[PDB]
Paper text:
Here, we present for the first time the structure of completely active full-length EcTOP1 in complex with single-stranded DNA ([name]). As revealed in this study, TOP30C actually contains three 4-Cys zinc ribbon domains (D5–D7) and two zinc ribbon-like domains (D8–D9). In the structure of full-length EcTOP1 in complex with DNA, the [name] segment is bound to TOP30C with its 3′-OH end primarily interacting with D5. The extended [name] also interacts with D7, D8 and D9 but not D6. The Zn(II) ion is coordinated by four conserved cysteines from the β1-β2 and β3-β4 loops. Binding primarily involves parallel π-stacking interactions between the guanine ring moieties of G29 and G28 to the aromatic side chains of the residues Y622 and F616, respectively. Residue R189 is the only residue from TOP67 that contributes to [name] binding with two salt-bridges to the backbone phosphate groups of G29 and G28 and a hydrogen bond to the phosphate group of G29. However, it is D6 that forms extensive interactions with TOP67, mostly through its unique helix (α1 of D6).
[name] topoisomerase I (EcTOP1) encoded by the [name] gene is the prototype type IA topoisomerase required for preventing excess negative DNA supercoiling. The C-terminal domains of EcTOP1 are essential for the enzyme to have the capability of removing negative supercoils from DNA rapidly in a processive mechanism.
Residue numbers in the entry: 2 to 39, 61 to 358, 362 to 799, 803 to 818, 825 to 844, 850 to 862
DNA sequence: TATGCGATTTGGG
């Protein structure tokens, strides 16, 4: 008999095992084991959800597939133990995970215990098992409440979106609120218009001291800001024909305090800015550092530091830096006694280089965490700032700089590189004369609002009280690959389906899309977790406000229903029939479709032209002006002035669409001669017709399509422009049915040699290995070597040998050569 | 990468 300890990770199992001996046996349930599924209509709805809002939120949890073997293995080990310790993670999600464990195991409540720890160290684990607590039901309900609200919205708004807007549309309770933020930002940029203005730089020289770079600030006691080449040159020459004199010198002692230790949000931003880590990577690495006992729990909103940790770090600083770097009293940081702690090293003496079994990106993150934690307890840095004001004729120039006098906390956490006002100015004095050397003019433009990064969006979600440290990364992850937004060049871009759905939801679910209300809902869950509210009651108040909104939305758009997807007609003629085309938007994206679709199905034009959006490439990276210049490349709508989106119709026409589509019917067509991605592709002769075959890049790999609109004898594109042999027609088979559809099997040939696949591909997508038994009479060409035949044999393939062989099981195997077969 | 895979190249509103 012994004590059973259950965790959620083998990596977490091995590390906690180092501090548990004798009667403690640990086991890990790899992932979740129990969760929701993944009078007639309503009944089928609750079966799909696994939650009955009309029957007091009765839930029907179902064990996950492929987890049946782990549960039983965990069930067996339980009975062999006297007591059970649930060692899941700190947060509520972990509590709910621990609850699912107790539920599938069984037994009395006193048979279980809930341990809690900020870090996986000898001391911290000892303290956790010293006085284990019970499973907090209030915190579990705070999760299940959230989990239920998330599913209700997801499963009751989505079918409404299909009927009204487009198919394949998903909806999230908080995700729709995050998208709206991106959508709104997108509309601040498109509505913006960069304007031209100029700057001049006069590089001069001190009276035999050094070089002094200046910058014009004023002209005629008025701020100097020309708008074109002409006005500049007018000031340029005038500056050349002038004598430069210093007016004032202001020397001011400045400081810079270090930042607070990391919380989850601040960690993601610093890793994005300094390391270039996305939110997903940052949290993956942090979890690996946590489960290895290197850092504290990475889901936190506290900047608190334990007395031990503070004593630990202050000791290190004293030993390794000296008394100048140690403040008289510990540095305190404001947070949002929570019994929660910042993200920090578990041992300040462990360096990043001393990390075992941690990948490169995990070591970089630790170093980041380590340096911030050490610096957060060191002395402020001191500087000697000097600002110079220089007059020249009817002008007023300026220069600013500083000199490091005490590095302080920056000794352990230095900047990546120099900054703007980090130059060292030569010593001069009021009255000194400067000699002109070089005048440098520069053309600038006004900057539009900066796009969200994955981290800066989180920073915004936290500012508005939207979401929690436990859900920040899931929000960022779950708003992508939905067709609402996308991340390119480490920045968020709003898709058109984003703007459309967002607008729709704002019209029929105003409260659900409200920032403050969404923030209040997070509070209501905290209130449930703190025994200040009952969970089923909160759900009832939510579900009541939800149905009221949903009902009005389900109705027809005349009586307050949700407006259907609009359409903007173009002067574009259908290539199949003869009608004006319209710009419609789907889940997949934007395209052109014939107006001959509203007609009864007897006479509808099912022809569409996929509009391909131009690649917003900031790859040139023209500094912080990259997003600015990317906007200036856009045309302004001839109706509203809003920035337009560019699409390619054909290689001769180019469609510009207003940013406020479909609220603005504005568009333009740029006649020209454009190039597609596969313009430089190879050309080859078709086996059938004899015409040319060009390169098209589809979603299933690059391929060679014939240019004759009568045949489809294609070819596959290999690596580096190579083209495949003239293909081969598949071989069908009678009385060889499948295992899913009413389809039969056909013998194909691919990169994995020769195999056997469905006939209705890809509607079936069913494949198995052809038996040597398993035809031979219908075997085409040289494929008969396998049909020669030798436990029942089956045809295999080897990547190394690049030759096809056969094996058998129920371990026997054999190969072939230029002669025959051998075993 | 230990005897996993392959091949198709719209439709969408
Ligand atoms: Zn109310
Ligand atoms: Zn048509
Ligand atoms: Zn417009
Ligand atoms: Zn052909």
């Amino acid at each position: 008999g012994k004590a059973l300890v259950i965790v959620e990770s083998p990596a977490k199992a091995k590390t906690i095992n180092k501090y548990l001996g004798s009667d403690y046996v640990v086991k890990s349930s790899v992932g979740h084991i129990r969760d929701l599924p993944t009078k007639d209509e309503r009944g089928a709805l609750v079966n799909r959800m696994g939650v009955d809002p009309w029957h007091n939120w009765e839930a029907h949890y179902e064990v996950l597939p492929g987890k049946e073997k782990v549960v039983s293995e965990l069930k067996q080990l339980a009975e062999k133990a006297d007591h059970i310790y649930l060692a899941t993670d700190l947060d509520r999600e972990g509590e709910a995970i621990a609850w699912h464990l107790r539920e599938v195991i069984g037994g009395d409540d006193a048979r279980y215990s809930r341990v809690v720890f900020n870090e996986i160290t000898k001391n911290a684990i000892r303290q956790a098992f010293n006085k284990p607590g019970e499973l907090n039901i209030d915190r579990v309900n705070a999760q299940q409440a959230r989990r239920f609200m998330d599913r209700v919205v997801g499963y009751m708004v989505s079918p409404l979106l299909w009927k009204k807007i487009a198919r394949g549309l998903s909806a999230g309770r908080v995700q729709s609120v995050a998208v709206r933020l991106v959508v709104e930002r997108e509309r601040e940029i498109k509505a913006f218009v960069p304007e031209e203005f100029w700057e001049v730089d006069a590089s001069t020289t001190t009276p035999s001291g050094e070089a002094l770079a200046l910058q014009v600030t004023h002209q005629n006691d008025k701020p100097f800001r020309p708008v074109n080449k002409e006005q500049t040159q007018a000031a340029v020459s005038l500056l050349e024909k002038a004598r430069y004199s210093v007016l004032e010198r202001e020397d001011k002692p400045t400081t810079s305090k270090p930042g607070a230790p990391f919380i989850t949000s601040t960690l993601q931003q610093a890793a994005s800015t300094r390391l270039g880590f996305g939110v997903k990577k940052t949290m993956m690495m942090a979890q690996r550092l946590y489960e290895a006992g290197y850092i504290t729990y990475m889901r936190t909103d506290s900047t608190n530091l334990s007395q031990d940790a503070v004593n630990m770090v202050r000791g290190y600083i004293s030993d390794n830096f000296g008394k100048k770097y140690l403040p008289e009293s510990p540095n305190q940081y404001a947070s949002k006694q929570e019994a929660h702690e910042a993200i920090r090293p578990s041992d300040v003496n462990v360096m990043a280089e001393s990390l075992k079994d941690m990948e490169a990106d995990a070591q970089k993150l630790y170093q980041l965490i380590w340096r911030q934690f050490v610096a957060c307890q060191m002395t402020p840095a001191k500087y000697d700032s000097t600002t110079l004001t220089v007059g020249a004729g009817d002008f007023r120039l300026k220069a600013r700089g500083r000199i490091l006098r005490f590095d302080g906390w920056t000794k352990v956490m230095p900047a990546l590189r120099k900054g703007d006002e980090d130059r060292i100015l030569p010593a001069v004095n009021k009255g000194d004369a400067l000699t002109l050397v070089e005048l440098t003019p520069a053309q600038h433009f006004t900057k539009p609002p900066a796009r969200f990064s994955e981290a800066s969006l989180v920073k915004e979600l936290e500012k508005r009280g939207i979401g929690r440290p436990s859900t920040y990364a899931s929000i960022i992850s779950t708003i992508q690959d939905r067709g609402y937004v996308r991340v390119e060049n480490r920045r968020f871009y709003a898709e058109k389906m984003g703007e459309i759905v967002t607008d729709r939801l704002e019209e029929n679910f105003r409260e659900l899309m409200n920032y403050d209300f969404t923030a209040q809902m997070e509070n209501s869950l905290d209130q449930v977790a703190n025994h200040e509210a009952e969970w089923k009651a909160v759900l009832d108040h939510f579900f009541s406000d939800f149905t009221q909104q949903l009902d009005k939305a389900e109705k027809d758009p005349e009586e307050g229903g949700m407006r259907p997807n609009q359409m903007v007609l173009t002067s574009i003629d259908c290539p199949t029939c003869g009608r004006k085309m319209g710009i419609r938007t789907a889940s997949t994206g934007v395209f052109l479709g014939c107006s001959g679709y509203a007609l009864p199905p007897k006479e509808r034009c099912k022809t569409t032209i996929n509009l391909v959006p131009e690649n917003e490439v900031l790859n040139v990276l023209e500094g912080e002006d990259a997003e600015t210049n990317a906007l200036r490349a856009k045309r302004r709508c001839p109706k509203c002035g809003t920035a337009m989106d560019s699409y390619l119709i054909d290689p001769k026409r180019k469609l510009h669409v207003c940013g406020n589509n479909p609220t603005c019917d504005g568009y333009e067509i740029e006649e020209g001669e454009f190039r597609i991605k596969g313009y430089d592709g190879p050309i080859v002769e078709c086996e059938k017709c004899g015409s040319e075959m060009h390169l098209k890049m589809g979603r299933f790999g690059k391929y060679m399509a014939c240019t004759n609109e009568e045949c489809k004898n294609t070819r596959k594109i290999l690596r580096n422009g190579e083209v495949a042999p003239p293909k081969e027609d598949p071989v069908p088979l009678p009385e060889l049915p499948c295992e899913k559809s009413d389809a039969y099997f056909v013998l194909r040939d691919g990169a994995a040699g020769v195999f056997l696949a469905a006939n209705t591909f890809p509607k079936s997508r069913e494949t198995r290995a052809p038996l040597v038994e398993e035809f031979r009479d219908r075997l085409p060409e040289k494929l008969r070597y396998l049909a020669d035949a030798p436990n029942k044999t089956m045809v295999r393939f080897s990547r190394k040998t690049k030759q096809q062989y056969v094996s058998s099981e129920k371990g026997w195997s054999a190969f072939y050569v230029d002669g025959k077969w051998v075993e």
